[PDB]
């Protein structure tokens, strides 16, 4: 059964919420970004209405094969009437595709669903400038004072500078990027422009790269193996046995690899400086795990929810346990009396 915090009250919608079978009363189920714990339900015998961006709709139908009929894409940025509500998609800066979304109620209330989101300053000069929210459904996810981590920006930086300098040490060295779902696809595309290459990858991930309306993207990827000194691998397989295994294949073109894992926070950011990252190393394999985040930090996420000041709270993440609810209520309250709203 749809838990409450997948609903919309006051309509016929849903967000997320294609898991729970026919959801009594939807009339049109929201899907915000292709993750699959969001998606997890949907397939090409899916037979109600789903409203997402263009990408988002690109990616179900060509990887899930929903048919073309029941995908109904929105622009972003543009006030849409749906089942008769206005409705507005936003960019989430999460992975491509992903959206905000502001429902404006029949009664007057005004909601915004985050969806998964990296709360940016930008955002405070969207359309959310214009008026009130009363109730913000919230990406919650690294909401405690804990999780930092650097900009996007700095990571990359970091990514290029390590890639560039390895490969120019030793032009016999191979580059590694794991994978398994879509977005920071930013930390394979810089390395691989900075060294001159295509990224070269399975059909499989070249087929999902192809939904997403990159511009030039045909110059950037391959499913030549052999022309590309940057190859996309499974997550999985970003690990010194896997990585043994992958050289092997490469029939003496290369005599060291140089692989990243992008992860999100890891406990190593309470301690290490983006500058003074370190690799795991066992021979010929050096495996760096760099904190590529795509949701809010607490200081982003904080900044936000003080500036869009609204009135109700729902955390979307993080809800199972009594004590992350506990600490997430007591963090939305020091905000709210910090500010003075
Ligand atoms: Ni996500």
Not at 63 to 84: A, M, S
Not at 197 to 203: A, D, F
Not at 237 to 243: R, T
Not at 317 to 324: A, I, Q
Request: hydrophobic content about 35%; aromatic content about 12%; glycine content about 6%.
């Amino acid at each position: 059964t749809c838990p409450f915090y997948k609903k919309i009250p006051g309509t016929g919608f849903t967000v997320d919420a294609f898991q729970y079978g026919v959801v009594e009363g939807c009339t049109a189920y929201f899907l915000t970004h292709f993750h699959s714990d969001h998606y997890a339900g949907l397939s090409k015998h899916f037979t109600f209405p789903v409203y997402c961006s263009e990408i988002t709709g690109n990616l179900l139908k060509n990887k899930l094969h929903v048919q073309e009929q029941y995908i109904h894409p929105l622009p972003l940025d543009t006030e849409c009437i749906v089942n008769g509500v206005k409705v507005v998609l936003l960019d989430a800066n999460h992975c491509p595709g992903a959206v905000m979304i502001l429902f404006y109620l029949p009664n007057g209330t005004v909601i915004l669903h985050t969806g998964d989101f990296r709360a940016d300053p930008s955002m405070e000069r969207s359309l959310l400038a214009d008026q009130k929210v009363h109730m913000l459904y919230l990406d919650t996810t690294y909401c405690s004072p804990e999780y930092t981590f650097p900009s996007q920006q700095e990571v990359i930086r970091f990514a290029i500078n390590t890639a560039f300098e390895a490969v120019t040490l030793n032009p016999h060295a191979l580059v590694v990027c794991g994978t398994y779902s879509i977005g920071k696809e930013k930390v394979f595309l810089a390395i691989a422009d900075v060294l001159g290459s295509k990224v070269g990858m399975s059909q499989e991930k070249y087929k999902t790269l192809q939904c997403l309306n990159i511009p030039e993207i045909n110059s950037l990827i391959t499913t030549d193996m052999c022309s590309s000194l940057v190859h996309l691998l499974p997550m999985m397989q970003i690990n010194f046995k896997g990585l043994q295994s992958h050289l092997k294949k490469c029939g003496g073109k290369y005599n060291q690899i140089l692989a990243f894992r992008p992860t999100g926070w890891t406990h190593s950011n309470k301690f290490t400086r983006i500058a003074d990252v370190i690799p795991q190393t066992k021979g010929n394999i050096s495996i760096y795990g760099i904190p590529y985040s795509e949701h809010s930090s607490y200081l982003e996420m904080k900044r936000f929810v003080q500036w869009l000041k609204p009135q109700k709270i729902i955390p979307t993440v993080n809800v199972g346990t009594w004590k992350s609810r506990s600490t997430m209520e007591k963090y939305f309250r020091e905000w709210k009396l910090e500010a003075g709203y």
